[PDB]
Structure formats: C-alpha cells, structure tokens
Design a protein around this ligand. Structure first.
Ligand SMILES: C[S@@+](CC[C@H](N)C(=O)[O-])C[C@H]1O[C@@H](n2cnc3c(N)ncnc32)[C@H](O)[C@@H]1O
Ligand SMILES: C[S@@+](CC[C@H](N)C(=O)[O-])C[C@H]1O[C@@H](n2cnc3c(N)ncnc32)[C@H](O)[C@@H]1O
Ligand SMILES: C[S@@+](CC[C@H](N)C(=O)[O-])C[C@H]1O[C@@H](n2cnc3c(N)ncnc32)[C@H](O)[C@@H]1O
Ligand SMILES: C[S@@+](CC[C@H](N)C(=O)[O-])C[C@H]1O[C@@H](n2cnc3c(N)ncnc32)[C@H](O)[C@@H]1O
Lengths: 292, 292, 292, 292
C-alpha cells in the first residue's frame, strides 16, 4: 500500500455480520440434513473418544456447536464440555436439547453460549485453556476471505488455537475441496457427517475470481417429512457458502496458527490418509497437538 | 377441463429489467474505457466499410449503439444509420454527440432510439429491413440465460436477424470466451475495442454452476483523469456480466437465428480465423449474410 | 360448465414475516428499556395478582412473553404459567433466565415456547384452555393492518380469546393512542411498563394515510451503560411500529373477539378509568371475563 | 480527542442521491399526468409572459425543466432559455422534443443540461446571471430535510436565487400544503399544472415525526391509454415525496435566500391571494424580484 492511511472509515456499509444461518431455514431442518445423529456419530465416535482419552482430555470446547450433535455425545461420554457458536438459530436447538435432559447431571453441567471465531479470545475466556477443541462438520470453511488476504482465516484459526491448553488437542476439519474444485461438483449423498435420505439435492457453485477459486456455494434441497398429502411432497431449500480450502494450504494455515509449536496430522474420513490413495475422502480431519 | 394456455412457468427467474448500465457509472466513463475512439475505429474500419460496400449496403441498424462509437463512424462515412440501445444512460451520450454536430447534414438524419433485443421486433419497425445490422463490442454476451434454456438468447438473436433484409448482412461479435473460461482471466489491456491506458484493472469472475460455465463477471477499474491533486489519483469502478458463449455454440446459435438461410463466417480480430492458429483473438466477429 | 382463474388477492408484495425484533437490537437492550423490573412490576403486581386470585386462576398463558418480565413474576407467585412469543430473540432471554433458576421447582415447570397470535390456535394447543391470558406492555399494537381491513387484528384477537377457559380472564392492554394521535408525540419517560433513566429519547412518527391514522412509529434511544470512557457516552437505537388503536375501537374489537360472551372493563394505568378524568393514562388495560 | 467540529457534520446515514425520478416510470407517463400541455399552459401563460415582459426579461433559466413544458413555451415565445434538471429521465423527453423541432431556429438555440439545485452554482455558470428564473410545478418541495435542519432547503434556495441577475425575477411555486396537512388529503383532479382525465387516483400520506409534519407522499395512478383490450384497462403507478412547506415558512425561506434584497409577493393560482379568501388555491406562486 502506498502512502499512509490516516482516514479510513467506511462511507458504504453493505455487508455486516454475515451469519449464513440467520435466516433460520438451515437450522429448522439441520436434523433432517444430518439424518440419524446416532448413525452419524457411530463413525468416528470411537476414534474421537479414543484420541481424547489417549491424551487425557476432560475439558472440551466445541467452537462449531451447531445443534449440539458432537457436543451432546461428548457430554454423554462423561466429558466436561462447553459449546459455542455464532448462530443463535442453531444453538437454539442445542439449548432445547439440554433443557430436555436437564435432569441428567451430565447435561446440567453442559455450557452453551454464543461466540465467534473472529472474537473467540474475548467471547470465551479460555484462561487456563481446554484439553481439547473441536471444529468438525466443515464449519470453518464458512469463513470468507473478503479482506483480500486470508487475514480473517489466520485470526480465527489463531483464536481457536489459543483455546488449546499446552499438550492439548485441536480437531478441525474441512470438506475435500481439492476434489470439489477439480470436478466442480460436491460428492453426492452418503456423507459421514450428513447421511439422510431426506436430502434430495445439493447443487454446487464454484466462483473463481480472476482464475483463483474464491468460493464454493452449495444449494441444498431437503425434503421435510410430509409437507403435503400423498402425491405431493414438500421440500426446504437453503444455501451455504464456503471458502474452498485446498488441503496443503489448510495444513500450512492451521499449523501456523500454533506458531509451529504443535504436532500435525490429517486423516481422510477418520482413516489414515496418504496422497494418491485409492479412497477419496469427503472430509479432511486435521489433528493438532499443541506442545508449547 | 384442465385450463387455458400459458408460456412461462412459476419457477423460472423473470428478473427485473436488468439494465446493467442503469447505475450510469459505466456510461460516465465509457469514453475513458474505450480510449481513443479514432485509434479504436482505425482497426476494422477498413474491413467493416469494405464489407458494407462490397454488399451495397446503405441502410444500417446498430443494435448495440452504446455511446455511438461505430454508429457515428458509419454516419460520417455516408451511411444511413439508425441506432438503438436499451440503456438510456449510454444512448444519452450518442444523442449528446448528434446534437453537437447537428449542423452536419449527415448527423441531422441520424436516428437514435431506445430498444431491446428481446423486443426489437416491436421496438424497431424494420418493415423492409436494413441492408446491414451490427452488434459489435461484446454487447450480446450481456444477455443472461436465466430461463434455464438459451431461450432468451434464441429470441433476441432471432429478432436481431429479423432486421436483416434478404441479401443483407449481420455483424455480431463476442469476446473469445473459449480462452477466458480456459484461463479464468480475461486478456490484459491492448484491446481492439477498448484500448485506453486509463483502465488500470479488469478482474474476472467465472461462475460455473453444476460444472457448467454460467457467467463471467468483469470488474473494471478506470482512472478518471484527475480525481485528485498530484500524489493522489482517483478511479472509477463498475462491473458488467456476460454469458460465456463458446465459439462453436454461438456459431450454431446465430446461424439458427436465420433459419439456416444465410452464409456464415467468423474472423479472429477482423482477420481470418483458423482453429489452432498461433494468434489468439480477443473477440470473434461473426459475419452472416441472409439469403432467403 | 366448468371454470378457471388464478390467485393473488393482494396488490403489493408486502414484507414477509415481519418480526420487528428479528434484528435483535431491541432484545439486547430491553432490560435497559424496562429499567428496574422489580420497580416496574411493583405497580399492578397487587392488582394483577388480586384479580387472578379473585377468579381462582392457576393456569396462566402469556402471549407476549417478551423477556419474561411478567411471566417470571407469575411463576414466582406460584402460578402455572406457559409463555409464548413470536420473537426468538426476546424469548432467548426468558429462556436464559429460566435456566439460571432451573433449580427452583417453580421455574423447572415454567413452559416457554415460540408462537404467533395469527396462528396461536395451532401453536399452543389450549385444549381445555387457560384460567387467564395476559398480553401486557403494548404488544398487540404491533400487529399491522396491511390487509386493508382489521382482519389480522380480528383473527389474532380471536385466537387469543380462544385460549381463555370459560369463566377465565384476558388482560390485554395498549398505549393510549387517543392521546398520541392527538399530540403527535408519545408521553416522555416515567412509564409504568418502562421506567429507565437509560432511555434518553423516544421520537414518535405518525403516519396517517389518506386522513386516517395508519401507524405510529417510535424511535428509541437507550444508553448502554458504558459504551465509552468518561467524556464519551454510547447509545443503542431501535425502532418499533404500532397500529394506533383508539380506545373505543379496541373495546369493540376485543369484545367481539369473545362473541359478546364476556364481561368487559378497562382501567387507566391499572386504576379506574372514567372518560374526561383529569389523569391521562399512558396505557389502557382491558380486562375481559369469558362467560360462555 | 482531536476535533468534534471539523468541516460540517459527519453523517453516517447514506451517500446516494436520491433522484425520485430515477426509476423512470413517472417520466414515461408525465405527459399523461399533465394532460393537455396546451390547456395547462393556457392558464398563467398570459401572466408569466406579461410578468417576464414587464420586467424586460430575455434570458430565462428553468431549474425544474422536467419534460420541457414551460421551457418549450418560453422558447416558442421568443425567449432565450436554458433548462436544467437533475433527472436525466425527465430531461430525456425535453431533449427528444428539441430534436424534433431542431429545424426551428428558436429551438436550435435552446439549451438543455443536467443540474442539481444543491450544486447549481457549479452546474450552471450564471456568470452575469439570468433575467428570470422559474421553478414551477411543485418541484422544489421534492427536496427533503434529512439533515434535521432546513439547511439543504436554504442552500438550494440560495443557489437558485444566485442565478437571478439583479433586477431579475424568480418564480418559484409549491402546492398549498397548509391545506393538505390540514385535511390529510391532496386536492382531487382539476389541477392547473396537471389536468388529465388519465390520472385516476392520487393517494396522500402524511408523515409527521414527533408532532411535526415531515413529509407528504403522493401515490399516483395514471391510466396509460390502452394497456388492455376493451373490458380490461391498464394503469401505471408511481410515488413522489415532498416536504410540506407551509406558506408562511416558504415566504420566509425564499426571501432569506435573497438576503432580503428583493421584492416578494405571492399569488394563489396565479391570481391575487389574500389570506381568508374564499378560493383555496392548489398552488402558491412566489414572485421575487432581486434588487441588490
Ligand atoms: C455446518 S455448521 C455445523 C454443523 C454441526 N457441526 C454438525 O456437525 O452438524 C457450521 C457452523 O459454523 C458456525 N460458524 C460459522 N462462522 C462462525 C464464526 N465466525 N464463529 C463461530 N461459529 C461460526 C455456524 O453458526 C454453523 O452452525
Ligand atoms: C459493451 S456495451 C457497447 C459499447 C459499444 N458497442 C462500444 O463498442 O463501445 C453493450 C451494450 O449492450 C446494450 N444492451 C444490453 N442488453 C441489451 C438488450 N437486451 N437490448 C438492447 N441493447 C442491450 C447496452 O445498453 C450496452 O450499451
Ligand atoms: C413490547 S414487546 C413485550 C415486552 C414485554 N411484554 C414487557 O412487558 O417488557 C411486544 C412483544 O410482542 C411480540 N409479538 C409481536 N407480534 C406477535 C405475534 N404476531 N405473535 C406473538 N407475539 C408477537 C414480540 O415478539 C414482542 O416481544
Ligand atoms: C414535478 S417535477 C416538474 C414537472 C414540470 N415542472 C411540470 O410542470 O410538468 C419536479 C422536477 O424537479 C426536479 N428536481 C428535484 N430535485 C432536484 C434537484 N435537487 N435539482 C434539480 N432538479 C431537481 C426533478 O428532476 C423533477 O423533474
């Protein structure tokens, strides 16, 4: 940048806290999108639990709470979890669940609050920090690169990492965009995080600005059970936008978030991942262990 | 007893008259975008004039008038031209020009009216028709494919062709999208239609929906002479969207517009074009000659 | 002998679920707007409780829950209350409160759900009905008369009344619009429902369409404690719109909601009200007792 | 902690011009709205011409050109007129007219350019000034009082006055808002400036903010000849907003624009006006004669 900036300000304000779930439709049918939460959680439940235990983790912070899917599981499995999320439309359901099982000592001590990765540091006073932090379900990819540089990405990734107690863990994932970008289309159905026969369609939309992948927009079509007598089925339609993080780049990004003081590894779909391997994962789970 | 009959559906996007130049910023600086109209017109002036004359053309209809660039030239060259355009923001300047030279017999008799390809048939009563029709400057590509099918494209192309008197000519062009789509980026500066050192930047933006190129959006940055004392330069920014017509497809489309009753040919940048040729043209000029 | 036609009875496109509290700013500072909930509730607490008791009411439905102000009081006073509201942004706080006191048997049995007067009948299965229904705080006036006729008003008022068990009560209020319309301005500070020194300003805005009061829009300015070091105070600004219900009209409307099978009465600010009386009430509390 | 009073006032509202005629619908049917321009101009033609002549006026500047109605008349009557207007959508038609009669020496020398009262001083170099300035047809009332104080009004009124050569005239009018505000409704049909049987309806809309008239919004319904076969008539709908200038206030405002160096007078509908007079004028024509 030339010269010095003394008077920035903003004469035009178009965008502003853009909560993609503010409309509320995605939340209303998330359950329908996920399908059988038990069937979903069945996969990687063993791995996540095993990993958490192997590193003696008891305090877990879920920064992508959503409707509570994984927070709930960790709660049931005896962990001390606190869940945050920026969308009060989503949290609204996790809360609903907690209240429903408010008579279970475990759930009584479940913490659910609103927070944003961009301002996590101030939203969730980590203090000593957590034994483990989780960002599953392709949540981070929602963060856009509006500023031109992945600054936002870096900041958010930093704050999140800042919640990991030394020797703690960070499990953050993202869709396999190395494939979506290559084929223009996102994998059809049979997803480990979202496996519901209710989801009738997912239309991709890749936007490369000046020859560089800038954004992937998915348009979902989830059939709301019923929505019309026999002969007329009804559906719900919502759209979500993600930054297509290529594996290599994220690996670098996330690692940098820890200032290199960490141990990085990545699995395909919670299975070991070696480039060139036959199996093409739909998600890439990054496992980081802070050391200093 | 079913019902009556309809043409449109209850799901397609009917848009809302979307004049991309309605905002007026593009018009305000078009002159700056084109640069030296004389230098511009210098190229292809010989060819256009030569072609028009070779086919004894006197009545010329310009469906992409814009600010009048090519209509003015044809007027000065003794042709009987009538120019139409959908943007009254652009026409506004051609008009301004005509009035300025209202004392030149040639210009008195210059006709400038508003019209839209989609409704050309009713906007411009061709009656007998024109000896030649021109749509230069990558104007047609503006028409979107909202309806799902290139229906709009077909209709507009039909109306335009319908203005060509039998034996008449139709010179319609478009950017070389076979290259833009391939590289993601549009060629930098040094354009035959727009050659101005004032244009500092043109950022592309390819949007492929479900693996199919759907739209190319260019974001221009033209420096408005002055716009700040020495040390601080000022610019103007506007965006235009085009349907990326691949050569082969357009050839087919435009030909069909004449019901096959025509003679088709296409030049690179007003030079002969042979696929695989070294030179990569920035535009593709289609020359059609109605026969029946 | 068999027909055809179409739909669309309205002329404009209207808004679409227009939750005035959807933005969330009014909720965020409602507490600041009300002031000392205890001080507020102090007034009319005796009357409300006295009235409820005098008619042997135990089951109370609060259709204007809001942040829970009056639902909470009723809960504490040993009533069996269920609260509904259309704004999940407001309810969000009542919920928050209930959870906080989740250890109090009373609050454990407090029911809080989302609902809309327009669809109350389906949102809250009254079944047998409630002993009393309350709509305090000038909440009903939010309902607009978009349809041209007070149809919406009539429907909502009907649904609400439909929740009152025979012999039950309905306490519904509204601002004294007979005065606002007359003076163009709403009363300044010192309100029985909202008494906070934090509210710095309330700008009225009367919109009479073709000589008939159509809407009153209030623009609030509530100082958020702090919002700047000494020397610089910070405020929050939000707007709410109400239909200016003139007393006489509402009396008629609400009574009609009960099909005349009721006993109507209205108090000034929870004090007896006689037209022409010196004291000018800020609100009008309508007390209805269903008989059949 | 630098300076609270730098230049003027740091507004964070908007930064766009709000051309009420930008949409273009009002222009498209203005002709229909006015009706018989000849019949319209018939009234006050004698007065205007007489007044202009009585004060030896030859150079006339029309700041509310519109479609050219009154500019055209003055041109035909041998005056040297230059017309400006902010709406290029309206001017577009005056221009169209001038070109049509481009062969009439009179019209050849007719000047039509875009300009805004707010920046008149820089848009139209008055230099020596004009013998007379006209702002007829309730045009000035369009200027809003967004800034809170009638600053804009004062500035615009100043610029306009600044175009009047000493000893020159200024004819500026406005609707009788003292009546509209009183009755809520605007006079029905039979207007001196707009007398067309095509205008089927004009719905008012008075917005008084905190008991002070802030804006009058009129919603017009003009039948576009035809717009449907026999049995189905078609109309066009547009809305315009005005600041309800009460007579007394405008007299004060406009006079101040001349720094008191003027001779003021006001007529009803181009007839003498005495308060309390039986006849209720629809417009108030202010006649000012600069003296110094
Ligand atoms: C795909 S959803 C998660 C669904 C859930 N994890 C599951 O597995 O079903 C992504 C979540 O990211 C959250 N999110 C997006 N941007 C955020 C931010 N800046 N701070 C906090 N949460 C954010 C949203 O609120 C959204 O619920
Ligand atoms: C790139 S500009 C032309 C510039 C000019 N031809 C030149 O060479 O400088 C494209 C023009 O297409 C016109 N246009 C777009 N859609 C149109 C439509 N449906 N009917 C008529 N004109 C249309 C616009 O008004 C715009 O001026
Ligand atoms: C002024 S607030 C109530 C504040 C609270 N009663 C108090 O006394 O502080 C009005 C409430 O009406 C509710 N409301 C408006 N329209 C509604 C509708 N159609 N159905 C249900 N609630 C509605 C809103 O959600 C809003 O919280
Ligand atoms: C009611 S119309 C005039 C119609 C015409 N005078 C007649 O008598 O038929 C008002 C005109 O005021 C013009 N106008 C509004 N604000 C303006 C401004 N700030 N500067 C210049 N013209 C303005 C508009 O462009 C509009 O054409």
């Amino acid at each position: 940048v030339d010269s010095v900036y003394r008077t920035r300000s903003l004469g035009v304000a178009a965008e502003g806290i853009p909560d993609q779930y503010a409309d509320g439709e995605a939340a209303r049918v998330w359950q329908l999108y996920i399908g059988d939460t038990r069937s979903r959680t069945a996969e990687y439940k063993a791995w996540l639990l095993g990993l958490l235990r192997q590193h003696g983790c008891h305090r877990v912070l879920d920064v992508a709470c959503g409707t509570g899917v994984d927070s709930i599981m960790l709660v049931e499995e005896g962990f001390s979890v606190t869940s945050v999320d920026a969308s009060d439309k989503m949290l609204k359901y996790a809360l609903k669940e907690r209240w429903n099982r408010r008579k279970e000592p475990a759930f009584d001590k479940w913490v659910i609050e609103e927070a944003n990765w961009l301002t996590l540091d101030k939203d969730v006073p980590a203090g000593d920090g957590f034994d483990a932090v989780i960002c599953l379900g392709n949540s981070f990819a929602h963060l856009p690169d509006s500023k031109g540089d992945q600054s936002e990405h870096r900041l958010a990734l930093k704050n999140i990492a800042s919640m990991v107690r030394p020797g703690g863990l960070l499990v953050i994932d993202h869709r396999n965009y190395d494939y979506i970008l290559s084929t223009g289309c996102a994998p059809p159905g049979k997803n480990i995080y979202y496996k519901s026969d209710l989801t009738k369609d997912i239309t991709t939309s890749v936007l490369t600005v000046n020859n560089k992948a800038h954004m992937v927009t998915l348009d979902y079509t989830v059939q709301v059970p019923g929505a019309g007598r026999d002969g007329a089925p009804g559906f719900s339609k919502f759209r979500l936008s993600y930054y297509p993080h290529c594996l290599a780049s994220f690996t670098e990004l996330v690692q940098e978030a820890f200032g290199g003081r960490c141990q990085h590894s990545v699995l395909g779909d919670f299975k070991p991942y070696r480039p060139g391997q036959a199996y093409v994962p739909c998600y890439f789970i990054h496992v980081l262990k802070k050391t200093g």
